[PDB]
Design a protein around this nucleic acid. Structure first.
Ligand SMILES: Nc1nc2c([nH]c(=O)n2[C@@H]2O[C@H](COP(=O)(O)OP(=O)(O)OP(=O)(O)O)[C@@H](O)[C@H]2O)c(=O)[nH]1
Ligand SMILES: [Mn+2]
Ligand SMILES: [Mn+2]
Ligand SMILES: [Mn+2]
Ligand SMILES: [Mn+2]
Ligand SMILES: [Mn+2]
Ligand SMILES: [Mn+2]
Ligand code: NA
Length: 326
DNA sequence: CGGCCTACG
DNA sequence: CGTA
DNA sequence: GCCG
């Protein structure tokens, strides 16, 4: 089993959900306590189990697996022996974990903000609403639309949103294209948001596009929240039968020279992409981001025509999006 | 021991 | 900091 | 927490 998540296929449906979900609780809790390193190990260990071909039924089956040491192995051992891990259950039931999960799931609130509020004694969304001076405009929007943003986004919603984004993009720039990215491109049936990547086949024509698209959406009444720019993390007023619901939408514009890199980056998964970028730098000496792949010794960028080209230049077997669910 | 993805808003 |  |  390869050590990096970008070296192995990880399908959407896999055989060790119970074990991986427990390790991901410990990862999330490690993040809440400010240890990104422990979060990463627990995330990596969870993802190793997602890549296995069969259910783990014996502790024996972990031997040699990357990112399984004493702590992650003990969690699996307890789950196999007893069906529950005491440490996981203690974190699950804790006021700190529950509140930090509640606050960080708000759009505009991360760990550092949530931790400050926790330390000030706040515990509920009504507590935050009662203290509105404590909130940025982004946080006000996330709180205002929190109920809708907690409702899974479905494929029906994606299709409707892609049509209205395509209409605005076509009005803003003839020939520009819209590509669905994020979890839906990896095959997920649900999501917390919809992600779109916009480009134009003629390099340079996309300059200034995203403000024009946003103006056209805003004047059709489709925008509840947004804020030269090339990324917009929006909330849309999506029409529904007789009504509407708020939906998070991410819009990104890239020049066509960068489109394979942006498509790769925005397709995820989040762990897959951080592993790929780690692999690129640490194993291949190349610097990867959503704009390009840089060789820092020759001072040159790799010209890619496809995602496949990027994998090949990194010496990796190509993985289609549905196998990037690390 | 120290690293842990990487930008833009 | 937030996007996460 | 695990690993180079
Ligand atoms: N399901 C869900 N996910 C949420 C909420 N709030 C929130 O921040 N998230 C975050 O949403 C991210 C994954 O959502 P997603 O379904 O869009 O997956 P994705 O791979 O496209 O992630 P991406 O859109 O962040 O790139 C996670 O990092 C998770 O922390 C929420 O209320 N529900
Ligand atoms: Mn026991
Ligand atoms: Mn998404
Ligand atoms: Mn995500
Ligand atoms: Mn840029
Ligand atoms: Mn150390
Ligand atoms: Mn440590
Ligand atoms: Na958040």
């Amino acid at each position: 089993m390869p050590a990096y998540a970008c070296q192995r296929p990880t399908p959407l449906t896999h055989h060790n959900t119970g074990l991986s979900e427990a390790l991901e609780i410990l990862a999330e809790a490690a993040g809440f306590e400010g240890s990104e390193g422990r979060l990463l190990t627990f995330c990596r260990a969870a993802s190793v189990l997602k890549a296995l071909p069969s259910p783990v039924t014996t502790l024996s089956q972990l031997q040699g697996l990357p990112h399984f040491g004493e702590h992650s192995s003990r969690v699996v051992q307890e789950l196999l022996e007893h069906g529950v891990c005491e440490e996981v259950e203690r974190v699950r039931r804790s006021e700190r974990y529950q509140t930090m999960k509640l606050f960080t799931q708000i759009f505009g609130v991360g760990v550092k903000t949530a931790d400050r509020w926790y330390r000030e004694g706040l515990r509920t969304l009504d507590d935050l609403r009662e203290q509105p001076q404590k909130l940025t405009q982004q946080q006000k929007a996330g709180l205002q639309h929190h109920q809708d943003l907690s409702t899974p986004v479905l494929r029906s919603d994606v299709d409707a949103l892609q049509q209205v984004v395509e209409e605005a993009v076509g009005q803003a720039l003839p020939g520009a294209t819209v590509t669905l990215t994020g979890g839906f491109r990896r095959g997920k049936l649900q999501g917390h948001d919809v992600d779109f990547l916009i480009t134009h086949p003629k390099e340079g024509q996309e300059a200034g596009l995203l403000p024009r698209v946003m103006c056209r959406l805003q004047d059709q009444g489709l925008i509840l929240y947004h804020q030269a720019f090339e990324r917009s993390f929006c909330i849309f007023r999506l029409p529904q039968p007789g009504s509407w619901k708020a939906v998070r939408v991410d819009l990104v514009v890239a020049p066509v020279s960068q489109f394979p890199f942006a498509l790769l980056g925005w397709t995820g998964s989040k762990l897959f992409q951080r592993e790929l970028r780690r692999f690129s730098r640490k194993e291949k000496g190349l610097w990867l981001n959503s704009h390009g792949l840089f060789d820092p010794e020759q001072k040159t960028f790799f010209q890619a025509a496809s995602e496949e080209d990027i994998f090949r230049h990194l010496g990796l077997e190509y993985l289609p999006p549905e196998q990037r669910n690390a």
